[PDB]
Amino acid sequence: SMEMDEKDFAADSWSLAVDSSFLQQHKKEVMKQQDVIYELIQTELHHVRTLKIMTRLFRTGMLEELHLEPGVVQGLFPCVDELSDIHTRFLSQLLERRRQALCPGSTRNFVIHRLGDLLISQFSGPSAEQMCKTYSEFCSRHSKALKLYKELYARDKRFQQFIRKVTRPAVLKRHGVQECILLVTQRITKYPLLISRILQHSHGIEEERQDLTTALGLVKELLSNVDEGIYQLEKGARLQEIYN
Amino acid sequence: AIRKKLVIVGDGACGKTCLLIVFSKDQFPEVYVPTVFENYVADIEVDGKQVELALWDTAGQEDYDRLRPLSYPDTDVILMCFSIDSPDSLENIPEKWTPEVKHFCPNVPIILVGNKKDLRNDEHTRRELAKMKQEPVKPEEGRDMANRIGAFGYMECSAKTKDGVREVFEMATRAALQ
Numbered sequence: 001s002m003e004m005d006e007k008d009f010a011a012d013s014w015s016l017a018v019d020s021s022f023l024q025q026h027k028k029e030v031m032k033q034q035d036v037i038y039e040l041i042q043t044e045l046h047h048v049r050t051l052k053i054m055t056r057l058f059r060t061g062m063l064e065e066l067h068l069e070p071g072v073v074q075g076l077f078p079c080v081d082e083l084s085d086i087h088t089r090f091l092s093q094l095l096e097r098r099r100q101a102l103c104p105g106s107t108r109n110f111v112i113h114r115l116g117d118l119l120i121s122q123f124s125g126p127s128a129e130q131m132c133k134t135y136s137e138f139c140s141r142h143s144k145a146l147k148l149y150k151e152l153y154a155r156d157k158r159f160q161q162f163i164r165k166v167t168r169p170a171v172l173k174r175h176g177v178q179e180c181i182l183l184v185t186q187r188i189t190k191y192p193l194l195i196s197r198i199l200q201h202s203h204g205i206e207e208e209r210q211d212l213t214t215a216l217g218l219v220k221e222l223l224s225n226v227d228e229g230i231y232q233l234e235k236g237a238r239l240q241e242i243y244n
Numbered sequence: 245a246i247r248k249k250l251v252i253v254g255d256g257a258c259g260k261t262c263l264l265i266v267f268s269k270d271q272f273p274e275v276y277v278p279t280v281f282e283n284y285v286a287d288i289e290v291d292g293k294q295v296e297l298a299l300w301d302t303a304g305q306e307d308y309d310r311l312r313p314l315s316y317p318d319t320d321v322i323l324m325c326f327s328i329d330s331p332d333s334l335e336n337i338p339e340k341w342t343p344e345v346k347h348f349c350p351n352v353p354i355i356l357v358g359n360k361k362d363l364r365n366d367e368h369t370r371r372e373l374a375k376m377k378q379e380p381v382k383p384e385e386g387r388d389m390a391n392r393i394g395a396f397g398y399m400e401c402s403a404k405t406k407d408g409v410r411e412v413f414e415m416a417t418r419a420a421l422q
């Protein structure tokens with residue numbers, strides 16, 4: 001993550017991120033809506049950071065310091081480049097919507113009134129087909145990736161040595177290889193909970209309530225399709241096991 | 245410090261996200277309660293043993309039967325939650341959650357946890373349940389269910405008052421070590 005976005009999202013809530021004299025000028029209903037919107041952006045920023053740990057720290061570190069095959073690394077971090085592209089683009093739109101909403105003379109005081117339109121765009125058309133195919137692929141290769149990691153850690157001395165070294169910093173405490181894989185798999189199921197709670201405090205403007213109700217329906221349709229598209233791969237699985 | 249994995253399961257709104265938040269947060273959330281929980285690695289010292297306990301939630305995965313089991317690999321302890329203001333959530337324990345957890349996590353100890361014990365003597369809770377011929381889950385109904393499903397043990401807590409929370413996680417650490 002970059003310092004600028006980390007400081008903008010360091011506080012535990014929107015009510016604590018903005019100046020208290022700016023907070024005091026708003027209704028409680030607005031504060032409640034803005035707190036859940038802030039949590040959606042803060043967790044998207046953390047998710048993109050998890051994918052950068054997977055591509056830059058783990059994946060590239062293995063390719064540059066170890067003598068493993070490129071197909072081993074691909075099995076350990078499936079679709080990480082595609083996933084990083086999708087979520088970095090989504091995060092860029094969320095951060096621009098916040099920046100556009102800032103008060104002149106301020107880098108922290110803002111109110112996001114429109115979000116549903118941005119959520120409909122992300123979860124519809126070509127961008128939704130690409131998240132659907134990418135998550136169906138990722139979640140079907142999840143078990144194989146964990147099994148491949150465990151095989152390499154217990155058999156390869158230099159792989160075990162690499163892991164102990166790059167995961168030693170305190171900032172990586174909850175971000176090992178297996179933790180990053182489950183963090184990515186669980187991300188998609190957080191969106192309906194966040195969007196439903198934002199919708200709960202977005203009844204003031206009818207266009208916004210409808211845009212968020214449409215966005216909630218799109219995320220649920222996407223999740224149902226990713227769930228249907230999953231067929232868990234096994235390393236060294238035989239054709240007979242598959243067609244039975 | 246050995247590494248152990250904990251997963252919390254149970255119906256939506258059974259208080260499992262709140263339970264993980266109140267345990268992992270150093271200070272009680274007085275300003276904002278987060279909607280979701282990502283993960284957390286707790287440093288726990290129980291009976292003289294130091295353990296790194298990784299905490300995971302299944303909230304959001306209850307309607308997705310092919311995504312949900314991806315949370316189970318290498319689990320060392322399962323916290324199976326129900327809500328004490330919800331007898332319907334206790335009824336779903338032996339037919340839905342228990343067969344799923346025993347299939348994907350064979351031999352993994354399960355601790356049955358009765359959440360929201362503060363609502364047992366709440367007037368709004370008792371009035372609302374009485375309008376459906378019901379009452380809050382009694383302690384013996386929780387223990388009889390834990391006994392019936394083959395649980396490692398039965399425990400109660402309140403994420404709102406923090407009572408019993410530390411005890412649940414220290415006992416889960418002990419169960420993961422066996």
Ligand SMILES: *CC(=O)N1C=CNCC1
Pocket residue numbers: 193197261262263277278279280
């Ligand atoms: C634990 C808690 O209070 N919440 C979790 C999900 N939806 C909003 C609130």
